[PDB]
């Protein structure tokens, strides 16, 4: 299976109410493993998965030092962006950064990414080649030229292809029981009087799943109500798909469940 390690940074300004609140979280696949909150009392990177607790004091000290410095730089970015956009000093604004690496089923580097957003919109992103940048607008062209001159891409490329892959493999090994597991969905259906048929998938991992309804074997794509996949809170995910069915015609409908954890796709019927 392919795997990923990703970090998500969010910083939100609050002028008059102190420095911006900075939040960072790290994930391997769909499993969160670390967090940092600038408002929390610890002022440290903290474990959020059992397998990262293995890491020694040097890891927590190093990640803390780095995360704090990242919090400081995104605080500066918020000031820089407010300036680039001639915005007021009184308003609250958001910066987001996401980066990470993917490995294939052979656990070798497949791709890297590093993206930035201002107020929830694309700002600047590193291209797949890990050598060039995509700037969203005029303001982002200033950053783009700044990062080209400073050879940021070359330095980031060394992290994405080297360090990121190294630690992702390490985590996959150390957290094998959690990370290299597949929990097949537990499924069932409900019926609500026209009638609603709802297909359920619970307790599955990873989060990637396909739920489809068919009427006489034809996909009902434009008529299926599909909810966002949601966390159960115990490390697994849940999802449902529903269709409004002519009363009495339930026998014509089948729900199909596809997930990496199933030996074979499942078919559900209202019986």
């Amino acid at each position: 299976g392919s795997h990923s390690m990703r970090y998500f940074f969010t910083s939100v300004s609050r002028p008059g109410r102190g420095e911006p609140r900075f939040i960072a979280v790290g994930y391997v696949d769909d499993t969160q493993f670390v967090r940092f909150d600038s408002d929390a009392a610890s002022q440290r990177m903290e474990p959020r998965a059992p397998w990262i607790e293995q890491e020694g004091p040097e890891y927590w000290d190093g990640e803390t030092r780095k995360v704090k410095a990242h919090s400081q730089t995104h605080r500066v970015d918020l000031g820089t962006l407010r300036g680039y956009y001639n915005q007021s000093e009184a308003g609250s604004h958001t910066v987001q950064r996401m980066y990470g690496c993917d490995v294939g089923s052979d656990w070798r580097f497949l791709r890297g990414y590093h993206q930035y957003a201002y107020d929830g919109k694309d700002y600047i992103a590193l291209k797949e080649d890990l050598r060039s940048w995509t700037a969203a607008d005029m303001a982002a062209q200033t950053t783009k030229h700044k990062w080209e001159a400073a050879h940021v891409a070359e330095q980031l490329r060394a992290y994405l292809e080297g360090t990121c892959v190294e630690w992702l493999r390490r985590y996959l090994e150390n957290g094998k029981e959690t990370l290299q597991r597949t929990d097949a969905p537990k499924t069932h259906m409900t019926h609500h009087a026209e009638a609603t048929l709802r297909c359920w998938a619970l307790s599955f991992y990873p989060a990637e799943i396909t739920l489809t309804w068919q009427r006489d074997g034809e996909d009902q794509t434009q008529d299926t109500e599909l909810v966002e996949t949601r966390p159960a809170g115990d490390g697994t995910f849940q999802k449902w798909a529903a269709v409004v069915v002519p009363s009495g015609q339930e026998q014509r409908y089948t729900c199909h469940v596809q997930h990496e954890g199933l030996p074979k796709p499942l078919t559900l019927r209202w019986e």
Binding site: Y7, A24, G26, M45, Y59, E63, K66, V67, A69, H70, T73, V76, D77, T80, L81, Y84, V95, Y99, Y116, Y123, I124, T143, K146, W147, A150, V152, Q155, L156, Y159, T163, C164, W167
Partner: peptide, 9 residues
């Protein structure tokens, strides 16, 4: 593990 490179827009 975090990236250790500091960058600013």
């Amino acid at each position: 593990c975090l990236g250790g490179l500091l960058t600013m827009v």
